From a paper:
Protein tyrosine phosphatases (PTPs) play a critical role in regulating cellular functions by selectively dephosphorylating their substrates. The ∼280 residue PTP catalytic domain consists of an α/β structure, and biochemical and structural studies have led to a detailed understanding of the catalytic mechanism (Barford et al., 1994; Zhang, 2002). Key features of the domain include the PTP signature motif, the mobile Trp-Pro-Asp “WPD” loop that in the closed conformation positions the conserved and catalytically important aspartate residue, and the phosphotyrosine recognition loop. Here we report the crystal structures of 22 PTP domains, including two tandem-domain RPTP structures and a detailed structural comparison of this protein family.
We also report here structures of two tandem-domain RPTPs, RPTPɛ and RPTPγ, revealing the domain organization for the PTP subgroups R4 and R5. Superimposition of all five tandem-domain RPTP structures (CD45, LAR, RPTPσ, RPTPγ, and RPTPɛ) showed that the orientation of the D1 and D2 domains is highly conserved and root mean square deviation (rmsd) values of less than 4.4 Å were obtained, for each pairwise comparison, considering Cα positions of both domains. Surprisingly, sedimentation velocity measurements showed that all single-domain RPTPs studied (IA2, IA2β, GLEPP1, DEP1, and STEP) were entirely monomeric in solution, as were tandem-domain receptor PTPs (RPTPα, CD45, RPTPɛ, and RPTPμ). The determined molecular masses calculated from AUC velocity data ranged from 68.5 kDa to 74.2 kDa in agreement with the theoretical mass of monomeric tandem domains. Moreover, analysis of tandem-domain structures showed that the orientation of D1 and D2 domains is highly conserved and is incompatible with the inhibitory wedge model due to a steric clash of D2 domains. In the present study we showed that this is also true for RPTPɛ, which is in the R4 subgroup together with RPTPα, the prototype of the inhibitory wedge model. In the fourth category, both the gateway and secondary pocket are blocked and the inaccessible binding cavity harbors an aromatic residue or a proline in position of Arg24. The second-site loop assumes a twisted conformation in these phosphatases. This architecture is present in the subgroups NT5 (PTPH1, MEG1), NT6 (PTPD1, PTPD2), R1 (CD45), R2B (RPTPμ, RPTPκ, RPTPρ), and R4 (RPTPα, RPTPɛ). RPTPα, RPTPɛ, and RPTPσ displayed a more limited peptide recognition capacity in vitro, which may be related to the presence of a bulky residue in the gateway region.
Author numbering: 112 to 128, 136 to 181, 183 to 281, 288 to 406, 425 to 472, 478 to 574, 581 to 691
């Protein structure tokens, strides 16, 4: 196994689709585990087969209690940086205090948690931080100063002290699935950049932990190391590195499926890599790339089954089977897909304009997924083409099957008209649903301003925080295009306000992987940039 030039990475990935992974050394033959197996230390290890060797063991200061030296953690090098990380086992009740003493004695500023607390009812790691307020863990008082919950990870700011108090930031990756590795490595690369951002140049080693302290924790350390190697050597050698880190902590990467995943992340980071940009700071090429996002046509069964054919305005813009909106019972089908927002999963329902023969279903979707906000981006007719069925009453009330819609208020503001309805189901019988009907999109082309588009996003956000905080029903006609533009800018703008960063490309690309042809035309993509420019001023 020799190094792969990045020039040939994509090809070698194809060719290798297990044997490589099985040739790695299990770090056990050049190692010594005397200290880890001491009787005194038995109860301190979560898994008795996954133990630090004596040489790279993190060694705590001796606290007159015997065998107080020990913790299940080991130093791990980065690409050209001795001891960049500490790969630690996720602490348990009995070692929570010893854990913080490590963070303190090692001068660490960052903890990377790659596990959830419980997994399918099995406790994979004990909570070692206060929910609210403060807690003294031994001679170290930890205090929560902030918690920010984004969709793929959450971020916690601690203030630890026993003279100078110190700020430790915990980055907790929530998205990692129970069984197997993730799906895209998109989330993990963004997460890994946020760690680079929040760790100070002067700080101690980064504490990375999962359950056993080898596996996720390993795939994470390797992906960082190998990004470094690309950015320096223009070549990647995953095999020689995993081999190296195992002689510091054995078993570092745990699965065949994990080893492959390092490569996928590395490829993603090469092919698409730098498309993020800071709000401080051509599109043609980026759009070509977006357009080469494969459509998972295998994974589109339900939407193509014969009965469901007739229910779609465009038999080509149709939900993937995994993130499709499913209703109470082929009556389970509505051309509509769940889409991740910036702060939570399944935050938007991106749907088509109801057909005259799918209003019943439409309103069942709204009712069954507790939607209270509808964003409409077309008019009923456009250029003499019937682009959406009017599903809402204008004057009185209308009953679409079991649901009843009665219109309470209807205010035509600048660009957006804003209707209010009492949706009933013929004491949890009645809701108030609010429709934002955007008249600011031209019958042909994109709008040339985007003040009115900023003002709609903004309007829908207040409505969300008030009628808090359910999934938003966005539709136009085809159910991807404008819906896409809107969902994209919603997420892009939230993050600009929040992180002061801007990655339109990945934003849209992430939309393409949830529903086909989401942002659709280069016009609409250009527009995204244009609205962000307008927002910045
Ligand atoms: Cl949890
Ligand atoms: Cl694991």
């Amino acid at each position: 196994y020799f190094p792969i030039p990045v020039e040939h990475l994509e090809e070698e990935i194809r060719i290798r689709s297990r044997e490589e992974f099985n040739s790695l050394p299990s770090g056990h033959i050049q190692g010594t585990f005397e200290l880890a197996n001491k009787e005194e230390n038995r109860e301190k290890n979560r898994y008795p087969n996954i133990l630090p060797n004596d040489h790279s063991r993190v060694i705590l200061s001796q606290l007159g209690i015997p065998c107080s030296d020990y913790i299940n953690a080991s130093y791990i090098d980065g690409y050209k940086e001795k001891n960049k990380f500490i790969a630690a086992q996720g602490p348990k009740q009995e070692t929570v205090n010893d854990f913080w003493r490590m963070v303190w004695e090692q001068k660490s500023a960052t903890i990377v948690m790659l596990t959830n607390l419980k997994e399918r009812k099995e406790e994979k790691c004990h909570q070692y931080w206060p929910d609210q307020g403060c807690w003294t863990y031994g001679n170290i008082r930890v205090c929560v100063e902030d918690c920010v919950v984004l969709v793929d990870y959450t971020i916690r700011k601690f203030c630890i002290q026993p003279k100078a108090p110190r700020l430790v930031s915990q980055l907790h990756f929530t998205s990692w699935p129970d069984f197997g590795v993730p799906f895209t490595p998109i989330g993990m690369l963004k997460f890994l950049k946020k760690v680079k951002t929040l760790n100070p140049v002067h700080a101690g080693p980064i504490v990375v932990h999962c359950s056993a302290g080898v596996g996720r924790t390993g795939t994470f350390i390797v992906i960082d190391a190998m990004m470094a190697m690309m950015h320096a050597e223009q070549k990647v050698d995953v095999f020689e590195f995993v081999s190296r880190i195992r002689n510091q902590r054995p078993q570092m990467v745990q699965t065949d499926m994990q080893y492959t995943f390092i490569y996928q992340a590395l490829l993603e980071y090469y092919l698409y890599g730098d498309t993020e940009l800071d709000v401080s700071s051509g599109l043609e090429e980026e759009f070509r790339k977006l357009t080469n996002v494969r459509i998972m046509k295998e994974n589109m069964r339900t939407g193509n089954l014969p009965a469901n054919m007739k229910k779609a305005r465009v038999i080509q813009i149709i939900p993937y089977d995994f993130n499709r909106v499913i209703l109470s019972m082929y009556t389970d089908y509505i051309n509509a897909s769940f889409i991740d927002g910036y702060r939570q999963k399944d935050y938007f329902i991106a749907t088509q304009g109801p057909l005259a023969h799918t209003v019943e279903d439409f309103w069942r979707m709204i009712w069954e997924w507790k939607s209270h906000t509808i964003v409409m981006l077309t008019e009923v007719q456009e250029r003499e083409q019937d682009k959406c069925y009017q599903y809402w009453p204008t004057e009185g009330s209308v009953t679409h099957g079991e649901i009843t819609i009665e219109i309470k208020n209807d205010t035509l503001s600048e660009a957006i008209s804003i209707r209010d309805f009492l949706v009933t189901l013929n004491g949890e019988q009645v809701r108030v649903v609010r429709q934002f009907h955007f008249h600011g999109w031209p019958e042909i082309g994109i709008p040339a301003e985007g003040k009115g588009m900023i003002d709609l996003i903004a309007a829908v956000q207040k409505q969300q925080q008030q009628t808090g905080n359910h999934p938003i029903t966005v539709h136009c006609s085809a159910g991807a295009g404008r819906t896409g533009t809107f969902i994209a800018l919603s997420n892009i703008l939230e993050r600009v306000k929040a992180e002061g960063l801007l990655d339109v490309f990945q934003a849209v690309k992430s939309l393409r992987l949830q529903r086909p042809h989401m942002v659709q035309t280069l016009e609409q993509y250009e527009f995204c940039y244009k609205v962000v420019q307008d927002f910045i001023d």
